[PDB]
Nucleic acid binder design. Structure first.
Length: 53
DNA sequence: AATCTATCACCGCAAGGGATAAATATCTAACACCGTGCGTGTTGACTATTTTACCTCTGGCGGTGATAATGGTTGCATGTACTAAGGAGGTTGT
């Protein structure tokens, strides 16, 4: 039975021990000079399976 | 807006669960080779791409028939409830 009653048993920690959970936003909107960043992987001199994935 | 005692309880702080990431081992996939066969190339003969010419399709549309035929079709607007208007004409009045 326990998993079949868990959305009623594990609904109790819900009211105490009161630390919680969440995710962010992290990027910027792109792009300008100097062209040190304005380059594809072509500029790196690296292998082919890397260049596929 | 500071103070705290005295709530109902979170912290006070022991235990232990899952997790994930390391190492291993398996999987697959990316590739480089090879071989196939197709769409790599010019040339050449074919036959029917197009044009024009000719001989002779399809379909443009104009034209109108005569033994005689010589009183026709057409069905349901609507049945109710109102009442405002015009139409009638005789006459007893203006």
């Amino acid at each position: 039975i326990r998993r079949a009653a868990t959305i009623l048993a594990e609904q109790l920690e819900a009211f105490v021990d009161l630390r919680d959970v969440r995710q962010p936003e992290v990027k910027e909107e792109k792009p300008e000079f100097d062209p040190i960043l304005l380059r594809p992987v072509d500029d790196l001199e690296l292998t082919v399976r890397s260049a596929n994935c």
